[PDB]
């Protein structure tokens, strides 16, 4: 996703009190809105609970090296939360690939 | 839609020489009375 | 940036003192080359020096500047 010619704050994106993990190397929350960025991109995907550890700058594995390589200057904030009541179903949900 | 052409006699392509051509502004800044160098994609002179 | 400069605040002490020493030495160089005499000698109004023409090195009153005609050429020659 590309966001251009738009105004977007992030206080509403943080006070939901529902995100399980919050790995944001963009800025500290108080100083992440006063300054400017040129373009905010969105890379959304699904992953298991044992592979969120490998999504970090400077780590190896089977997902962070073969699907999405994180650079050393990975300022992209990773917001992760559990929504297992919608994207999974009984009988085996195999619609997601990796 | 499109149609097809028929076989006819053409002319082979020729090769000429450029003379100080293919120079553009490499950036959107203003510079006055300065001689600066940039590393971008340009057409070589006398190529 | 200034908080981490305190670990190298001693380094900035010599650099400020070296340029201060350089600047005061450049100032001191001028008085050792030009200020040999402590009395300003005025050029006499009589220009009869036995045939020696001195208008080229002595200052001229035609211009507001006190520079000689060869000094004005020297001033404009170097950027």
């Amino acid at each position: 996703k590309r966001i251009s010619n738009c105004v977007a704050d992030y206080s509403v994106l943080y006070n939901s009190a529902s995100f399980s993990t919050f790995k944001c190397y963009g800025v500290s929350p108080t100083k992440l809105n006063d300054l400017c960025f040129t373009n905010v991109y969105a890379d959304s995907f699904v992953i298991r609970g044992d592979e969120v550890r490998q999504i970090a700058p400077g780590q190896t594995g089977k997902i962070a090296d073969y699907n999405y390589k994180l650079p050393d200057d990975f300022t992209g904030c990773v917001i992760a939360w559990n929504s297992n009541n919608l994207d999974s179903k009984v009988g085996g949900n195999y619609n997601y690939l990796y | 839609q499109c149609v097809n052409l028929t076989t006819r006699t053409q002319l082979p392509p020729a090769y000429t020489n450029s003379f100080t051509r293919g120079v553009y502004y490499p950036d959107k800044v203003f510079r006055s009375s300065v001689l600066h160098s940039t590393q971008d994609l340009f057409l070589p002179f006398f190529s | 940036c200034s908080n981490l400069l305190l670990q190298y605040g001693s380094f900035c002490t010599q650099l400020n003192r070296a340029l201060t020493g350089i600047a005061v030495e450049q100032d001191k160089n001028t008085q050792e080359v030009f200020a040999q005499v402590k009395q300003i000698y005025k050029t006499p109004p009589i220009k009869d020096f036995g045939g020696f023409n001195f208008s080229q090195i002595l200052p001229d009153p035609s211009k507001p500047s006190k520079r000689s005609p060869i000094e004005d050429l020297l001033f404009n020659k170097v950027t």
Partner: protein, 49 residues
């Protein structure tokens, strides 16, 4: 049977080279000097003059 008038178009490919750009007081480009074309042109762009 057709006619196309008279035209001539030139196609050239760009290469990554360092170019020395000259600017006047109006801000437009007057001349350009390459660094990998001539040894004389190399001396011009290394001396930045």
């Amino acid at each position: 049977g057709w006619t196309a008038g008279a035209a001539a178009y030139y196609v050239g490919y760009l290469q990554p080279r360092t170019f020395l750009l000259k600017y006047n007081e109006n801000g437009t480009i007057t001349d350009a000097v390459d660094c990998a074309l001539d040894p004389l042109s190399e001396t011009k762009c290394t001396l930045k003059s």
